[PDB]
Design a protein around this ligand. Structure first.
Ligand SMILES: Cc1cc2nc3c(=O)[nH]c(=O)nc-3n(C[C@H](O)[C@H](O)[C@H](O)COP(=O)(O)OP(=O)(O)OC[C@H]3O[C@@H](n4cnc5c(N)ncnc54)[C@H](O)[C@@H]3O)c2cc1C
Ligand SMILES: O=c1ccn([C@@H]2O[C@H](COP(=O)(O)OP(=O)(O)O)[C@@H](O)[C@H]2O)c(=O)[nH]1
Length: 473
């Protein structure tokens, strides 16, 4: 009776993060609402008619937090730990990831060009920092690496011209180069391997990453969770402190942990005394994102020799519509029926880059044949396609300024908008980040913590590993 009623909207990792922290604390006065039947949001998994396990782009787990690792161990027994083997298909070669560090694997002419332009851009200095991502990577890597990889690959994944993107999200995503190391790589044909936070990752033996959140759902108190299409939140009244759902039910909260898209939130949230309130519709309109198409191809037999131990593959060239392919069957044999393997292809989509959905599956197959993934004789089963409206929250120029206009106003009225699209911060938009934003929001609501470091300070969380444990393990 004395504790605040905490309501969580969304059973993705962020929402489930909040629910797990509350459960760990033995907190009783909360409830979680989800409009889908399945927990896990963008990290959910599917099982098809033919025994193929699929998900939304071949998710792998790589945690920045001891807490989240403990939760993984608690929720799921039976993990595979893999060494990342990732490649770029470009100029007819398999270039080890990251592209920019491994230009010695390009054909001679392209390698020379890449090296020469890197030397050239090193020779050019500038009074002001780059104003955008394209200016940044062009100055940093030179015109060779920009033209061959950065420019075409980035438009291909983001579906937004990179000159419209900010430059501060890149810390753990875009690897730097060192001219001396590259020259030596070229003399020795020495691959530069191991860079990045996912150089090692873990993957559940059965059920994909989505089994994590299905297991978590099972471990939480059933009467505190609602999974039902009628419980899609469609209006928030911040004065009354109520949520109205599509089925017409109205419920109260003292605190709201919202994980719905930030633009959706702004559009459906009413109240008085919000500073800047009448700007909210224009703010919502300015939030840039790409949609994501996932295509699953089930294949009879076993992968060809070059893909035997591959994880994921990058495709900058226009001979394929997908920016990435994942050999999902290499993450776990239980992902496919006996005697098969599988590819998962991702194709980005936006107003800048429209997609013809009626030909999408066939176009991907043509892409696979032209990109060394499939052969004409391959026998395909379980062709599958799924489209996600909000796939990547683009780190567009001005993003922070926009978030700063409204987020503090929402928080002052006990509304915490968190998660991949809840907070719209790509650089802390993976599963561990999201889950932890949920955990940290709960700590902040309950006064157990002064700050929410993940959502507020991406530099700090991605530079250190958080040490603190999860009690239930
Ligand atoms: C192609 C792709 C590949 C990815 N790969 C990786 C990876 O390899 N590793 C990794 O760690 N992360 C990966 N991610 C990121 C991962 O998907 C997210 O970090 C995570 O799913 C975000 O969780 P979230 O709960 O903040 O949002 P979501 O996961 O989208 O969860 C939000 C939930 O809210 C619900 N909801 C929305 N609106 C309402 C409403 N109005 N009413 C009621 N419920 C609502 C939704 O149904 C959903 O279930 C990938 C993402 C994509 C798109
Ligand atoms: O060889 C590479 C591959 C990717 N990237 C950059 O790293 C970013 C993140 O890509 P990744 O596959 O790591 O993240 P994801 O798309 O899965 O979120 C991309 O946008 C690229 O700009 C890069 O610099 N070199």
């Amino acid at each position: 009776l004395l504790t605040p009623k905490i309501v969580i909207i969304g059973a993705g990792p962020t929402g489930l993060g909040a629910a797990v922290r509350l459960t760990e604390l033995g907190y009783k006065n909360w409830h979680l609402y989800e409009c889908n039947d399945t927990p896990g949001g963008l990290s959910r998994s599917f099982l098809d008619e033919n025994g193929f396990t699929w998900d939304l782009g071949g998710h792998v787990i790589f945690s920045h937090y001891q807490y989240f690792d403990d939760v993984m161990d608690w929720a799921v027994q039976g993990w595979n730990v893999l060494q990342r083997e990732s490649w770029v298909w470009v100029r007819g070669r398999w270039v080890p990831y990251p592209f920019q560090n491994n230009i010695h694997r390009l054909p001679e002419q392209d390698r020379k060009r890449c090296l020469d332009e890197l030397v050239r851009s090193h020779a050019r200095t500038y009074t002001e920092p780059p104003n955008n991502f394209e200016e940044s990577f062009t100055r940093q890597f030179g015109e060779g690496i920009a033209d061959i990889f950065m420019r075409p690959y980035n438009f291909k994944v983001w579906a937004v011209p990179p000159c419209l993107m900010s430059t501060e999200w890149v810390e753990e995503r875009v690897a730097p180069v060192d001219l001396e190391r590259i020259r030596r790589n070229i003399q020795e044909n020495r691959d530069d391997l191991g860079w990045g936070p996912n150089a090692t990752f873990r993957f559940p033996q059965r059920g994909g990453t989505g089994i994590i959140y299905q297991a978590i759902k099972e471990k939480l108190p059933s009467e505190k969770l609602t999974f039902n299409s009628g419980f899609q939140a469609i209006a928030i009244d911040a004065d009354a402190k109520t949520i109205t759902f599509s089925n017409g039910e109205v419920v109260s909260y003292d605190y709201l942990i919202s994980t719905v898209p930030f633009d959706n939130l702004l559009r459906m949230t009413k109240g008085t005394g919000f500073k800047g309130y009448d700007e909210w519709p224009a703010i919502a309109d300015k939030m840039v994102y790409s949609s994501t198409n996932v295509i699953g191809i089930g294949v009879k037999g076993t992968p060809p020799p070059h893909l035997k131990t591959a994880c994921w593959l990058y495709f900058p060239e226009d001979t394929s519509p997908f920016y990435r392919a994942t050999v999902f069957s290499n993450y776990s044999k239980y992902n496919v029926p006996e005697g098969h393997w599988s590819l998962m292809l991702e194709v980005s989509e936006s107003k800048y880059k429209p997609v013809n959905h009626s030909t999408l599956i066939e176009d991907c197959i043509v892409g696979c044949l032209a990109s060394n993934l499939l052969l004409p004789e391959d026998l395909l089963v379980s062709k599958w396609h799924y489209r996600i409206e909000k796939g990547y929250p683009t780190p567009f120029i001005g993003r922070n300024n926009l978030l700063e206009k409204a987020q503090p106003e929402l928080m002052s009225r006990c509304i915490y908008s968190r998660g991949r699209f809840g907070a719209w911060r790509y650089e802390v938009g993976n599963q561990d980040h999201s889950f932890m934003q949920g955990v940290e929001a709960i700590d902040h609501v309950l006064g157990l913590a002064t700050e929410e470091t993940t959502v507020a300070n991406p530099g700090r969380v991605n530079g250190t590993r958080a040490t603190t444990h999860f009690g239930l393990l």
